[PDB]
């Protein structure tokens, strides 16, 4: 998945 702080 996408890391907690990603965008």
């Amino acid at each position: 998945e996408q890391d907690k702080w990603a965008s």
Partner: antibody, heavy 132, light 108 residues
Framework: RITLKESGPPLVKPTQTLTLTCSFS??????????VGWIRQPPGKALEWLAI???????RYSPSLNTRLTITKDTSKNQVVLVMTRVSPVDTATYFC????????????????????????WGQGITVTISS | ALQLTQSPSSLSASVGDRITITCRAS??????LAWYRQKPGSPPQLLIY???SLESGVPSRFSGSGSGTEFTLTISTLRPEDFATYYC?????????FGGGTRVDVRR
């Protein structure tokens, strides 16, 4: 000053359950966006990521070990516990816990996420041998 | 999953050299990449976070650049304490992968 230290049994037998504790000081697992993760290193091998837990209590695990890992926190004792079930000899490794910064805030407003991209402080590591 | 390949896996050098270690990811990880130096018997130590930011208290000879799928760590003037193994770590996708490491040893 942030410091972390791992504790648990140095020796464990196959099929048994391994419980490792990370006790830390210098930060609280109630601080904004902070994380504590676990990484292991079999002798002579590369680092291998295991899991991480954040202060808002989101948990994530290595997909390869997901079924055998449980990570939990005890905020008031400043500890993070990682439980690995059904260990086998290949689980012998040095186990490290580590701090992960949360975003920088300005007047309690998140303004920089670059500091979360690293595990910035590590514990000395605890050597665990799995043998019957 | 995501693959992080370090190059070279091993490298020889002498005090005063400039070395550069590179790490390539199988899919883009934006700037979420960290470099560490690990000396024998010790835990890894953070050198560079977020691909290029110098970690506080880390000597200026260490430098990191790149984003996306290709990153590099360069030590401009190798000191004796730099004979060690270096690792890169990706933090964009779970699981937060580590590269295979690159061993830097005394050339002879």
């Amino acid at each position: 000053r942030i410091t972390l230290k791992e504790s648990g049994p140095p020796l464990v037998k196959p099929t048994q359950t391994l419980t490792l504790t990370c006790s830390f000081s210098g930060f609280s697992l109630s601080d904004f966006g902070v994380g504590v993760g676990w990484i292991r290193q079999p002798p002579g091998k590369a680092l291998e990521w295991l899991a991480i837990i954040y202060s808002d209590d989101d948990k994530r695990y290595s997909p390869s070990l997901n079924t055998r890992l449980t990570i939990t926190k005890d905020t008031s004792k400043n500890q993070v516990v990682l439980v690995m079930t059904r260990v086998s000899p290949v689980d012998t490794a040095t186990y490290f816990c580590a701090h992960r910064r949360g975003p920088t805030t300005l007047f309690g407003v998140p303004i920089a996420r670059g500091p979360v991209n690293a595990m910035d402080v590590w514990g000395q590591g605890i050597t665990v041998t799995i043998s019957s | 999953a995501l693959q992080l390949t370090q190059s070279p896996s091993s490298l020889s050098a002498s005090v005063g050299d400039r070395i550069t270690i590179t790490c390539r990811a199988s899919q883009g990880v934006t700037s979420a990449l960290a470099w560490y130096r690990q000396k024998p018997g010790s835990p890894p130590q953070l050198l560079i976070y977020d691909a290029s930011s110098l970690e506080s208290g880390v000597p200026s000879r260490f430098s990191g650049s790149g984003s996306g799928t290709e990153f590099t760590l360069t030590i401009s003037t190798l000191r004796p304490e730099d004979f060690a193994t270096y690792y890169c770590q990706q933090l964009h996708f779970y699981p937060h992968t580590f590269g295979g490491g690159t061993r830097v040893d005394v050339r002879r």
